[PDB]
């Protein structure tokens with residue numbers, strides 16, 4: 001229990017550091033820019049709360065012979081569409097296309113959560129639904145959204161592509177962790193699972209945020 005608790009506290013601290021840095025960076029509150037900072041505060045702030053809750057030993061749900069971390073999935077349901085929103089803003093995406101990518105994202109996270117909570121082998125059908133919706137989300141990120149980003153200045157398009165790449169490459173690792181970890185075949189221990197996810201969560205949220213902060217200043 002000590003290892004898992006320690007990892008969750010590290011996640012909480014890293015998320016808190018991001019949250020404070022984004023809130024501070026955003027204080028200037030430029031009318032067009034404010035939205036991006038508030039979104040980053042929401043992304044890392046919600047994650048921080050989730051990690052604190054888990055560190056305190058809340059929401060460790062036993063499912064068959066594994067443990068499900070409910071706050072992790074609730075976190076993702078809330079924070080991943082905020083990341084997609086940030087990317088859609090950057091890309092200058094149209095309202096229909098925003099709706100599509102937010103829908104596909106929500107399918108991924110709901111299917112992953114539901115799958116984690118189903119004891120039997122039918123849970124892999126839920127994983128599959130999420131994997132299919134994720135391929136759709138990736139298509140949008142690398143296709144239509146990238147085309148949309150090209151209508152922006154070269155610097156904004158470069159930022160879009162940088163954050164798009166970070167997002168696509170790291171998000172693609174999560175389903176493999178689900179499959180190899182406790183929700184799937186339970187090869188990886190809960191500690192190894194949590195350690196990998198803490199890194200990935202921190203980079204996809206706080207790393208993502210610092211990359212945007214850097215580009216915003218350099219712009």
Ligand SMILES: CC(C)CCC[C@@H](C)CCC[C@@H](C)CCC[C@@H](C)CCOC[C@@H](CO)OCC[C@H](C)CCC[C@H](C)CCC[C@H](C)CCCC(C)C
Pocket residue numbers: 041042045046049050053058059060061070071072074075077078
């Ligand atoms: C906008 C809405 C339409 C979307 C709402 C999300 C919704 C879709 C989530 C669906 C799942 C929902 C049905 C939950 C059911 C889970 C339940 C079956 C699990 C069993 O319950 C286990 C409990 C305690 O043991 O864990 C319980 C887990 C914890 C109690 C919850 C974990 C906390 C969250 C991860 C953090 C939430 C964010 C903060 C409330 C806001 C922080 C703001 C920030 C800026 C400080």
Ligand SMILES: CCCCCCCCCCCCCCCCCCCC
Pocket residue numbers: 010011013014015017018195196198199206
């Ligand atoms: C300006 C730099 C600020 C960076 C934001 C993150 C703050 C550091 C918080 C500690 C992070 C813990 C490291 C966990 C890594 C993933 C699990 C590794 C276990 C081997």
Ligand SMILES: CCCCCCCCCCCCCCCCCCCC
Pocket residue numbers: 176179180185186187
């Ligand atoms: C482009 C592909 C990248 C290579 C990654 C390899 C694929 C990862 C395999 C994940 C699912 C395989 C399930 C078999 C795991 C072994 C079962 C052990 C039981 C505890």
Ligand SMILES: CCCCCCCCO[C@@H]1O[C@H](CO)[C@@H](O)[C@H](O)[C@H]1O
Pocket residue numbers: 132133135136137139144
């Ligand atoms: C959920 C899985 C979805 C699979 C990804 C295929 C979606 C892309 O499919 C494409 O959509 C375009 C809209 O931008 C259309 O113009 C194209 O005709 C169509 O081929």
